[PDB]
Design a protein around this ligand. Structure first.
Ligand SMILES: *[C@@H]1O[C@H](CO)[C@@H](O[C@@H]2O[C@H](CO)[C@@H](O[C@@H]3O[C@H](CO[C@H]4O[C@H](CO)[C@@H](O)[C@H](O)[C@@H]4O)[C@@H](O)[C@H](O[C@H]4O[C@H](CO)[C@@H](O)[C@H](O)[C@@H]4O)[C@@H]3O)[C@H](O)[C@H]2NC(C)=O)[C@H](O)[C@H]1NC(C)=O
Ligand SMILES: *[C@@H]1O[C@H](CO)[C@@H](O[C@@H]2O[C@H](CO)[C@@H](O[C@@H]3O[C@H](CO[C@H]4O[C@H](CO)[C@@H](O)[C@H](O)[C@@H]4O)[C@@H](O)[C@H](O[C@H]4O[C@H](CO)[C@@H](O)[C@H](O)[C@@H]4O)[C@@H]3O)[C@H](O)[C@H]2NC(C)=O)[C@H](O)[C@H]1NC(C)=O
Ligand SMILES: O=C(O)CC[C@H](NP(=O)(O)OCCC[C@H](NC(=O)CC[C@H](NC(=O)c1ccc(F)cc1)C(=O)O)C(=O)O)C(=O)O
Ligand SMILES: O=C(O)CC[C@H](NP(=O)(O)OCCC[C@H](NC(=O)CC[C@H](NC(=O)c1ccc(F)cc1)C(=O)O)C(=O)O)C(=O)O
Ligand SMILES: *[C@@H]1O[C@H](CO)[C@@H](O[C@@H]2O[C@H](CO)[C@@H](O[C@@H]3O[C@H](CO)[C@@H](O)[C@H](O)[C@@H]3O)[C@H](O)[C@H]2NC(C)=O)[C@H](O)[C@H]1NC(C)=O
Ligand SMILES: *[C@@H]1O[C@H](CO)[C@@H](O[C@@H]2O[C@H](CO)[C@@H](O[C@@H]3O[C@H](CO)[C@@H](O)[C@H](O)[C@@H]3O)[C@H](O)[C@H]2NC(C)=O)[C@H](O)[C@H]1NC(C)=O
Ligand SMILES: *[C@@H]1O[C@H](CO[C@@H]2O[C@@H](C)[C@@H](O)[C@@H](O)[C@@H]2O)[C@@H](O[C@@H]2O[C@H](CO)[C@@H](O)[C@H](O)[C@H]2NC(C)=O)[C@H](O)[C@H]1NC(C)=O
Ligand SMILES: *[C@@H]1O[C@H](CO[C@@H]2O[C@@H](C)[C@@H](O)[C@@H](O)[C@@H]2O)[C@@H](O[C@@H]2O[C@H](CO)[C@@H](O)[C@H](O)[C@H]2NC(C)=O)[C@H](O)[C@H]1NC(C)=O
Ligand SMILES: *[C@@H]1O[C@H](CO[C@@H]2O[C@@H](C)[C@@H](O)[C@@H](O)[C@@H]2O)[C@@H](O[C@@H]2O[C@H](CO)[C@@H](O)[C@H](O)[C@H]2NC(C)=O)[C@H](O)[C@H]1NC(C)=O
Ligand SMILES: *[C@@H]1O[C@H](CO[C@@H]2O[C@@H](C)[C@@H](O)[C@@H](O)[C@@H]2O)[C@@H](O[C@@H]2O[C@H](CO)[C@@H](O)[C@H](O)[C@H]2NC(C)=O)[C@H](O)[C@H]1NC(C)=O
Ligand SMILES: *[C@@H]1O[C@H](CO)[C@@H](O[C@@H]2O[C@H](CO)[C@@H](O)[C@H](O)[C@H]2NC(C)=O)[C@H](O)[C@H]1NC(C)=O
Ligand SMILES: *[C@@H]1O[C@H](CO)[C@@H](O[C@@H]2O[C@H](CO)[C@@H](O)[C@H](O)[C@H]2NC(C)=O)[C@H](O)[C@H]1NC(C)=O
Ligand SMILES: *[C@@H]1O[C@H](CO)[C@@H](O)[C@H](O)[C@H]1NC(C)=O
Ligand SMILES: *[C@@H]1O[C@H](CO)[C@@H](O)[C@H](O)[C@H]1NC(C)=O
Ligand SMILES: *[C@@H]1O[C@H](CO)[C@@H](O)[C@H](O)[C@H]1NC(C)=O
Ligand SMILES: *[C@@H]1O[C@H](CO)[C@@H](O)[C@H](O)[C@H]1NC(C)=O
Ligand SMILES: [Ca+2]
Ligand SMILES: [Ca+2]
Ligand SMILES: [Cl-]
Ligand SMILES: [Cl-]
Ligand SMILES: [Zn+2]
Ligand SMILES: [Zn+2]
Ligand SMILES: [Zn+2]
Ligand SMILES: [Zn+2]
Lengths: 692, 692
């Protein structure tokens, strides 16, 4: 039989292992020849595997690279202008890779050039609340200072935006052992921890879903009109550079000024974690100098797009996509995901060769330039937005398959919750101590839902990955799954975006039997299989009703911290709860009809109502000042692009509202967002009513 | 048989006559009790007629009314402040209506209040080119002057916007006999011309598709957040009032200053048509004073929505909509259209009672507050935008059925051209001298296409009516048809928006046998019938390809008036012509497939490609500073809301470009619009490619 079981059984751990090794021998940095060559290899193999069509879709987008002959570094300088300490120019390469060419040295992609010199301020994680603490409580002024921040907690682009708004003239990012060195584990190559010379690369843009900085709204094709750099979206205005903790210790150890305000500001280095500004008495005339000479350059990038045409609904697309570009070797990020995609394509193709086809079209994507701001997926979705809008059933992401070996992690739209529960009950757990048990059982035991007994935790979609354009801009039901660590005995994984993130890292420490990779291939591949083949789309609208009520309770509880203002300005959540109540009623009735209808028009009408339900949460006017975040229920947090926020329009209107100098105007805007949200929830509900 | 012929034969001229009489006995001004009562009558009758459901959809929107106890008027005042001449407070009512209550006196809806006093400047039609002529050629400064403009040529809202941008402190609008009095015809009640005491009512907003001024983007429902008046969309900032030509003559006769620049500035009154400023020597100390006391008030409005559920595709909507609110009696505008809609509903219902149903759902609408800015249709489309976006096949408008008795006038998307040709070849001409001939033959003879022998003229959609939200905002294929005058022996019709526009006007002078009304009911009703019942949607994509090439030629020819700048800034139309060429190729191939496929999924897939083709021309970012005009091929002209402009983004970027003080920036923006247009044409084309 050609059924999900056939598809699943054909997936092999050893294949995924072979593909991961194959993809991680040399760096595949976006816009380089090596990553174009990998694209052509993947294109060829997907054709060999049996896909109907496999094309490259290329764009010319703004990328950023260090200058090979003018290296980036940071100094402590003395009064005579002698640079008495310099940060490293590269990470010591790991065993056996010491002769590998083209390893990009650590840098912050899209930093402007500059050589600012000044006094340091330490800002903890550079989060919104860290700057509140500095400015409001500690009375420390960052204006004209170089800020040093530890990586962790939030997306590094938000840190830079926060430092810029505080008036900083530069930012130094560093990896603190508190956040990147698990106690009792050895650093690479002897364990999975970050060595003192290791450094996290990464872009520092604030694109808010725009895609290529020069072409917001439109694909960066051969005739595209480009904004001038001064009008580009999301570039930082101050120099930024990342360092490791050996180098950070040399920068922090001399810090004077104010003590850290409390223990949450202290990392693990043997330094006082003084906030500054500047150095203690004897060193008070020394300064910090950055030297950044990276350049932004419009560069060609290549997505691979594979199509497996549907037998019955070829105009309905289920998309499995993940990136291919990496900072260096991409042992975890993204090649552990890309190897799983490759095996999934291979398995679907085996079935296709035996005469099978999925009901709906499956599209497979290898995205480029994800690490530079989700550029490849976003340009392609801009090019194809009309097809995606009217035909996109779902998008399943496929970045890093593992960040740990403890349990599953799933983030998805509520419309997929029931699909994911059902699938994981039919998969075997690969966990020690759960042999013969389902993945659902092990996952539920290791990661219980905070709200329901006997259910697992499933998180909201945030961002920082290639689903953002499909979900938050276009309103296509989206999901992701991977294996993760125990968050209660441990900040991602330590070697993230370092030269040390290699094939050996995965093979030796994360997943030597490739059983977690295989489990992840079964979950992603199985979701795609069900989405593409189920007669009725496997979305349960009733799960959206439950979460909408949870999010309405949550946003109301935030507002209710301000009872006097709610009285004064007549701020009511009645309309939103009314909309949520109606959504619950209409969804329940729709579910009954879905169960209770041989009629393919009624089916397809009902599948269309299912497919367009996520779409109904899109507001074509976008959220305030973020026109590419159009989904009214979910947006990336304005304080941390990685985290999802629910009812983001209302959340941001209420955020720090007590500090707004015109409360009438601020509360007016809260009420406006309540209206927009109530209206959108009711409008989405009405898409599930009888159509005439 | 239940076929189009049965539907058509059931339509009766005498019914349409009865309904028109019934709808025009008293005024039905938006937001008044009489128009709520008419809504309830129509709702009841549509139910009686056999529709499946008939509901009222109400909204609370900003309307504008004169103050009953503080009348609007205009004076000439002398130096002592004595008002030596006052304009009329009302139009002399026509025979038999002298005791009719609740006739709103002439006013410009949404005028702010004020009593400005100053010197007059005559500005011809107050068009963009008229103000160019004043300011650039004649060196006449309108700043601080009251401007007087004749109605005609362009939408009166554009006149007011133009006068405001010229610095005018007030506007007087008047009906010149040149534009409202056909030579050799008597004025009402003895003929169809405008009497000297007649006055044209009408709103003067510049909404650019926003709908209710206080709620752009969202329906004005019971919990809606409203903008404060100062942030409202589209309100004028200077007082405006309309007068008739008896009163205009008294204002114009004393005018001094500069002679009119040429004969195109002279109307038909016995006055010199001097431009001013101010009066000739003896009267030079007299001024003009306006007194405007109208108020804007949020007011409830009611649309009637009738549903005739489709038998096979109930989730596909064909909409027949037209307004019900009138300035006074609405003898032509809108009740000649509304009576035709009523008869169309009656006929469809007769068939429904015999067991027939259309393939697709037909929705019938009686829109409210059209005369105050398309408010009823726009709020309802804002409320239902998700349903309309994903399910709207077409929108057929149904305002005034007659503006003359000469020939047909059709304005529609190119996707309907072939539908309209085919239908009109199957209808009888009602014209004298064409008995036994088709409507196509008479229409083609009387109104030949400017480009093709043996074809009739079909115009682009402009705006100023209830299709605007469906077509320019939402991208639903739209059309309209009516009977019109011979534009070559004659500015709409003379009695437009006057108390004299009555049932008797129509019955005595326009259409005594109601045969033109009947023809129009056959065309509108027949279009709806074919759209709702044809197995394959009756849209020919190839007709869009032909017009796109015409519009590309046209916009290129405008640019080519500036060869030096095109060289300097490297401005190429290559990408747009390439996109148009591709559209032509892909449409041709799609047409072959459409002809060449028992498979209802392929059919519906193909019908979806047909339905979403108009949709593909929508850009979700809108046109510059006009976010509700989203269609990239067609928008209302920025100089005249009534006229459609093709490639409006490029057109506006090129408009008066030689007067821009930064040519590099201006030509940059031309190139940007070329890119947006090329991309959108190519993207629309690709929706017609094989789907996988
Ligand atoms: C959740 O779903 C429910 C439906 O189960 C929706 O209920 C609607 O709520 C609105 C707003 O509260 C009601 O609006 C009211 O409508 C009255 C007229 O309704 C009649 O006519 C319409 C159309 O003809 C029919 O649909 C309806 O069946 C009735 O026959 C108005 O008269 C009301 O206005 C008056 O009172 C208000 C409030 O005090 C005053 O402000 C006004 O000035 C005026 O005096 C009012 O507008 C509507 O009737 C309800 N529909 C129902 C029950 O079917 C909820 O709106 C929905 N939630 C959300 C968030 O959308
Ligand atoms: C109307 O429809 C036609 C198709 O019939 C489209 O034609 C495309 O035109 C674009 C832009 O001109 C071509 O873009 C070029 O692609 C080359 C690579 O193409 C190959 O690879 C892709 C994917 O792998 C395949 O789709 C394709 O079949 C080829 O195998 C690039 O190398 C070109 O860039 C180089 O030259 C340019 C121009 O001198 C330089 O600026 C660059 O720096 C670089 O050196 C270029 O990008 C594309 O190949 C065409 N597709 C075809 C013929 O199938 C039109 O674009 C379309 N019109 C519009 C408005 O969309
Ligand atoms: O330009 C961009 O937008 C991104 C480019 C690039 N993307 P790339 O480097 O390819 O991928 C980074 C994705 C990090 C993200 N973190 C998160 O989602 C962590 C967010 C965090 N949640 C969690 O940490 C979390 C952990 C365990 C669990 F069971 C559930 C949740 C939170 O909600 O606060 C994740 O793990 O999915 C980059 O981040 O540099
Ligand atoms: O607020 C609004 O937007 C409109 C409210 C209200 N709408 P309401 O009062 O209900 O309806 C007014 C519609 C006038 C429009 N003129 C036009 O389309 C004339 C535009 C004109 N074309 C023509 O005059 C024309 C004539 C004959 C023919 F065979 C083809 C075209 C042009 O292109 O320059 C028409 O005839 O369709 C109003 O105009 O006051
Ligand atoms: C996840 O798995 C569950 C459990 O199998 C699925 O729910 C089940 O769905 C089936 C199929 O529609 C329901 O069967 C129906 O039962 C009713 C009578 O109770 C009858 O009217 C129908 O003819 C049919 O036999 C079943 O009740 C339902 N079980 C539940 C809700 O507990 C669920 O659909 C799956 N989720 C997916 C696929 O997203
Ligand atoms: C308007 O009326 C015209 C004339 O009837 C319609 O065009 C005609 O459409 C029919 C139906 O598809 C075409 O018939 C086909 O002919 C080809 C062989 O030539 C064959 O492959 C098919 O099996 C079928 O018999 C016909 O050719 C075509 N005539 C033309 C283009 O001159 C047109 O579709 C109508 N427009 C509408 C309904 O919007
Ligand atoms: C990248 O940097 C190179 C080299 O920079 C030089 O060496 C550095 C260590 C430092 O001393 C710089 O100031 C030096 O210029 C740049 O190449 C130079 O460009 C200038 C013209 O701007 C030229 O006169 C120099 O001779 C070049 N020097 C060398 C060694 O080639 C180059 O511009 C930078 N690449 C970029 C910005 O993309
Ligand atoms: C820290 O580095 C500076 C600069 O060194 C140069 O740039 C580095 C990135 C690396 O590529 C070096 O090889 C380059 O020479 C050192 O200061 C320079 O020292 C040289 C030779 O002594 C002198 O002629 C230059 O003028 C200096 N440049 C500057 C900008 O001062 C410095 O010695 C290093 N400090 C330490 C402690 O190693
Ligand atoms: C509409 O106008 C009335 C009446 O206006 C009065 O009569 C005019 C001819 C002129 O002389 C005005 O200045 C007069 O006020 C308004 O009613 C008046 O409102 C004021 C309070 O603002 C009150 O003191 C007066 O007595 C009222 N006069 C009468 C006759 O009722 C009314 O405000 C206006 N309606 C609106 C603005 O909606
Ligand atoms: C033109 O009208 C003004 C004002 O008349 C008032 O408002 C009109 C709309 C109408 O409703 C009249 O009945 C009102 O009296 C006349 O000037 C007024 O004259 C009266 C009585 O003579 C005097 O007491 C007022 O103060 C005047 N008001 C003003 C504003 O001047 C004027 O006479 C009329 N001119 C002509 C030629 O008829
Ligand atoms: C990754 O695997 C691919 C596919 O097997 C290898 O590319 C092939 O290499 C052989 C030997 O050079 C060639 O004959 C084939 O033409 C290649 N096939 C392609 C490109 O599709 C590639 O060498 C492997 N890379 C590494 C680093 O092991
Ligand atoms: C317009 O026609 C309607 C429908 O016939 C008339 O309304 C009816 O009037 C009769 C007599 O008053 C009532 O018994 C019915 O209840 C009404 N039917 C409705 C409202 O659906 C209406 O009187 C006519 N108007 C004019 C001005 O002639
Ligand atoms: C911080 O520092 C600069 C002076 O160097 C000043 O201009 C700026 O306004 C200061 N801000 C605060 C809040 O003190
Ligand atoms: C793999 O799992 C084991 C067993 O719990 C654990 O001790 C080890 O830390 C895990 N490795 C990684 C990289 O998380
Ligand atoms: C028109 O008139 C006023 C002076 O009353 C002046 O301020 C304005 O700038 C003038 N404009 C031109 C173009 O002369
Ligand atoms: C009706 O048609 C006749 C015959 O051409 C014409 O003389 C008359 O002007 C027309 N009436 C109107 C209102 O256009
Ligand atoms: Ca772009
Ligand atoms: Ca609105
Ligand atoms: Cl992922
Ligand atoms: Cl019309
Ligand atoms: Zn990644
Ligand atoms: Zn990454
Ligand atoms: Zn009208
Ligand atoms: Zn009108």
């Amino acid at each position: 039989k050609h059924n999900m079981k056939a598809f699943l059984d054909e997936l092999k751990a050893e294949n995924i292992k072979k593909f991961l090794y194959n993809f991680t021998q040399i760096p595949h940095l976006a816009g380089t020849e090596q990553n174009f060559q990998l694209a052509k290899q993947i294109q060829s193999q997907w054709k060999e595997f049996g896909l109907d069509s496999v094309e490259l879709a290329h764009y010319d987008v703004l990328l950023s690279y260090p200058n090979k002959t003018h290296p980036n570094y940071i100094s402590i300088i003395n009064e005579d202008g002698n640079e008495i300490f310099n940060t490293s120019l590269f990470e010591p390469p790991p065993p056996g890779y010491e002769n590998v060419s083209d390893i990009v040295p650590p840098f912050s992609a899209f930093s402007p050039q500059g050589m600012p010199e000044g006094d340091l301020v330490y800002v903890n994680y550079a989060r919104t609340e860290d700057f509140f603490k500095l400015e409001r409580d500690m009375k420390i002024n960052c204006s004209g200072k170089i800020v040093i921040a530890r990586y962790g907690k939030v997306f590094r682009g938000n840190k830079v935006k926060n430092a810029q708004l505080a008036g900083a003239k530069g930012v130094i990012l560093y990896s603190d052992p508190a956040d990147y060195f698990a106690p009792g584990v050895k650093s690479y190559p002897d364990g999975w921890n970050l060595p003192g010379g290791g450094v996290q690369r990464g872009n520092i843009l604030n694109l808010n879903g725009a895609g290529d900085p020069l072409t917001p709204g439109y694909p960066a094709n051969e005739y595209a009109y480009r904004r001038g750099i001064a009008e580009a979206v999301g570039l930082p205005s101050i120099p930024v550079h990342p360092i490791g903790y050996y180098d950070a210790q040399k920068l922090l150890e001399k810090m004077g000024g104010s003590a850290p305000p409390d223990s949450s500001w202290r990392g693990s280095l043997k330094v006082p974690y003084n906030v500054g500004p500047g150095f203690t008495g004897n060193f008070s005339t020394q300064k910090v100098k950055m030297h950044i000479h990276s350049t932004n350059e419009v560069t060609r990038i290549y997505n691979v797009i594979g199509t497996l045409r549907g037998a019955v609904e070829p105009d309905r697309y289920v998309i499995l996509g993940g990136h291919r570009d990496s900072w260096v070797f991409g042992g975890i990020d993204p090649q552990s995901g890309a190897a799983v995609v490759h095996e999934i394509v291979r398995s679907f193709g085996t079935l296709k060769k035996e005469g099978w086809r999925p009901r709906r079209t499956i599209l497979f994507a290898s995205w480029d330039a994800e690490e530079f701001g989700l550029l490849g997926s976003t340009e392609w979705a801009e090019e194809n937005s009309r097809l995606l809008q009217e035909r996109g059933v779902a998008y399943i992401n496929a970045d890093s398959s593992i960040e740990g070996n403890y349990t599953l992690r799933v983030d998805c739209t509520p419309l997929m919750y029931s699909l994911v529960h059902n699938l994981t009950k039919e998969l075997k757990s690969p966990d020690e101590g759960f042999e013969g048990k389902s993945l659902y059982e092990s996952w539920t035991k290791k990661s219980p839902s905070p709200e329901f007994s006997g259910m697992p935790r499933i998180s909201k979609l945030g961002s920082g990955n290639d689903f953002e354009v499909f979900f938050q801009r276009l309103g296509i039901a989206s999901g992701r799954a991977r294996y993760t660590k125990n968050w209660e005995t441990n900040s991602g994984y330590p070697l993230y975006h370092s030269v040390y993130e290699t094939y050996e890292l995965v093979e030796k420490f994360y997943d030597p039997m490739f059983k977690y990779h295989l489990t992840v291939a079964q979950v992603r591949g199985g979701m795609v299989f069900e989405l593409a083949n189920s007669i009725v789309l496997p979305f349960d609208c009733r799960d959206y009703a439950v979460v909408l009520r949870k999010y309405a309770d949550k946003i109301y509880s935030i507002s209710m911290k301000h009872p006097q203002e709610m009285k004064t300005y007549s701020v009511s959540f009645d309309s939103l709860f009314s909309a949520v109540k109606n959504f619950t009623e209409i969804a329940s009735k729709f579910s009954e009809r879905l169960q209770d209808f041989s009629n393919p028009i009624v089916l397809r009408m009902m599948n269309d109502q299912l497919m367009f339900l996520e779409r109904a949460f899109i507001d074509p006017l976008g959220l305030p000042d973020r026109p590419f975040y159009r989904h009214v229920i979910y947006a990336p947090s304005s304080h941390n692009k990685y985290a999802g926020e629910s009812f983001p329009g209302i959340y941001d209107a209420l955020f720090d509202i007590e500090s707004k100098v015109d409360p009438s105007k601020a509360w007016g805007e809260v009420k406006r967002q309540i209206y927009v949200a109530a209206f959108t929830v009711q409008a989405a509900a009405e898409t599930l009513s009888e159509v005439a």
